[PDB]
């Protein structure tokens, strides 16, 4: 049972503009991006704003803090640069930018690289220099997914871009996964053994199709930190809500559905705390069908 614990909004704004979230390295504090390009730090229990920083001149779509608390990735809608890396030690400052990448992620084991996505193209950057180390795109193997998002595997040896598996060291495509949908390009399971591409679950070693999970169709997915639960929310077909009003949970060990939660409001983002005690969900109290952006963050205790 996802038990509500707290609710809060962007303080003292006529219309609340939270768009995305991630827990900080400090217990009790959530980082939220906003539709005017700010980063906010909030106490999730009191609902009070602690700090605000200026990141972009357009809506933040997504953000990701490094596990060590030293760095932050942000992505925006229209800005130049589209994505950026921020230092959060001593002073909040821009370390590097990624001008044309509309989505960025850290590498997973050692967080020394950033992978950015531009359409069906992946770009790998060094955190220290900001230099682009690699561009990954093979015209012969492209799936041309419409909502592609390039990603590292748990040990940072492989990248999945546009449904193509790349060996990062050789910068060579080693396998193209067959196309079953127009949009979703896929993620690695944290177990290191499986690739989840829309409804298809592939074995990474043999490239065999292991399972079909129809309820994952058109979903973005995130796992809890401990890798026991997978959350999926279906994309929707100024910033409109990326998701509909529902999310689904699955057992990460066997892909069996656990719960389907309809929050009856469009969802902008979802995350868990580092101890996987809580779920924070950004939900629009209004609707952009009426051009009303007025989001809240809802905090739930996971059952
Ligand atoms: C205007 N705009 C908003 C987005 C966006 N916002 C949140 C996104 C996003 O992907 N959020 C992740 C979690 C995370 N923070 O990584 C998520 C995963 C499972 C879910 F059930 C839910 Cl509700 C969200 C995303 C998102 C959606 C699609 C893609 Cl391909 C990439 C994204 F980052 C993107 N554009």
Q: Parse the chain into domains and list their residue ranges.
A: 3-301
> Is the shortest distance between the CB of 280 and ligand 1 below 6 Å?
no
| 200: CB partners within 8 A, 6+ apart | 177, 180, 209, 211, 212
Q: Is residue 248 a contact partner of residue 215, using CB atoms and an 8 Å limit?
A: yes
End-to-end CA distance of the chain: 5
> Is the shortest distance between the CB of 247 and ligand 1 below 6 Å?
yes
**DSSP bridge pairs for 54:** 38
Picking from 132, 140, 71, the residue whose alpha carbon sits closest to that of residue 101 is 132
**DSSP bridge pairs for 196:** 187, 201
Largest Cα separation within the chain, whole Å, is 55
User: What is the DSSP annotation of the chain?
Assistant: --EEEEEEESTT-SS--EEEEEE-SSTTEEEEEETTSEEEEEETTT--EEEEEE--SS-EEEEEE-TTSSEEEEEESS-SSSEEEEE-SSS-EEEEEETT-SEEEE-SSS--EEEEEETTEEEEEETTT--EEEEE--TTT----TT---EE-TTSSEEEETTEEEETTTTEEEEEPPP--SS---EE-TTSSEEEETTEEEETTT--EEEE-GGGTTEEEEE-TTSSEEEEEEBP--PPPSB-SEEEEEETTT--EEEEEE-SS-EEEEEE-TTS-EEEEEEESS-TTTT---EEEEEEE--
Experimental method: X-ray
Q: Which residue in this structure is represented by tokens 């924070």?
A: 280
> Is the shortest distance between the CB of 149 and ligand 1 below 6 Å?
yes
| 226: CB partners within 8 A, 6+ apart | 276
Q: Six-digit token pair at 255?
A: 């892909």
Q: Is residue 144 a contact partner of residue 138, using CB atoms and an 8 Å limit?
A: no
> Is the shortest distance between the CB of 220 and ligand 1 below 6 Å?
yes
In the reported structure, the alpha carbon of residue 224 is separated from the centroid of ligand 1 by a whole-number distance in angstroms of 15
Q: To which CATH superfamily is domain 3-301 assigned?
A: YVTN repeat-like/Quinoprotein amine dehydrogenase (2.130.10.10)
Q: How far is CA 199 from CA 174, 191, 194, 222, in A?
A: 22, 18, 13, 15
> Is the shortest distance between the CB of 267 and ligand 1 below 6 Å?
yes
In the reported structure, the alpha carbon of residue 246 is separated from the centroid of ligand 1 by a whole-number distance in angstroms of 13
Beta carbons within 10 angstroms of residue 260's beta carbon: 11
Picking from 11, 62, 37, the residue whose alpha carbon sits closest to that of residue 243 is 62
- Give the C-alpha separation, 75 to 66, whole Å: 15
Residue nearest atom 11 in ligand 1 by C-alpha distance:
269
In the reported structure, the alpha carbon of residue 216 is separated from the centroid of ligand 1 by a whole-number distance in angstroms of 14
In the reported structure, the alpha carbon of residue 149 is separated from the centroid of ligand 1 by a whole-number distance in angstroms of 10
Atom of ligand 1 nearest to the CA of 21: 15
- Give the C-alpha separation, 224 to 246, whole Å: 18
- Give the C-alpha separation, 16 to 106, whole Å: 28
Atom of ligand 1 nearest to the CA of 242: 3
């Amino acid at each position: 049972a996802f038990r509500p614990i707290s609710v809060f909004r962007e303080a003292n704004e006529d219309e609340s503009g939270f768009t995305c979230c991630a827990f900080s390295a400090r217990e009790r504090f959530l980082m939220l991006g906003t539709c005017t390009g700010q980063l906010k730090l909030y106490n999730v229990f009191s609902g009070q704003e602690e700090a605000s920083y200026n990141c972009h001149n357009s809506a933040i779509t997504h953000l990701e803090p490094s596990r060590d608390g030293s760095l932050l990735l942000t992505s925006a809608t229209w800005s130049q640069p589209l994505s950026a890396l921020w230092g959060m030690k001593s002073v909040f400052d821009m370390k590097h930018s990624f001008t044309e990448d509309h989505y960025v992620e850290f590498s997973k084991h050692s967080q020394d690289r950033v992978i950015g996505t531009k359409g069906d193209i992946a770009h790998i950057y060094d955190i220290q220099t900001g230099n682009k180390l690699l561009t990954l795109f093979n015209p012969d193997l492209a799936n041309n997914y419409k909502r592609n998002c390039a990603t590292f595997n748990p040990t940072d040896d492989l990248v999945l871009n546009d449904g193509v598996l790349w060996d990062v060291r050789s910068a060579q495509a080693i396998h193209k996964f067959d196309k079953f949908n127009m949009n979703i390009s896929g993620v690695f399971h944290p177990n290191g053994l499986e690739v989840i591409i829309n409804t298809e679950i592939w074995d990474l070693r043999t490239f065999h199709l292991l399972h079909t999970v129809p309820a994952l169709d058109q979903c973005r997915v995130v796992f809890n930190h401990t890798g026991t639960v997978m959350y999926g929310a279906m994309l929707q077909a100024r910033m409109k809500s990326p998701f509909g009003s529902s999310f689904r949970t699955f057992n990460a060990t066997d892909y069996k559905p656990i719960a389907t939660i309809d929050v009856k409001r469009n969802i902008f983002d979802l995350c868990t705390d580092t101890k996987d005690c809580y779920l924070a969900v950004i939900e629009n109290q209004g609707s952009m069908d009426a051009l009303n952006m007025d989001t809240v963050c809802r905090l739930y205790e996971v059952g």
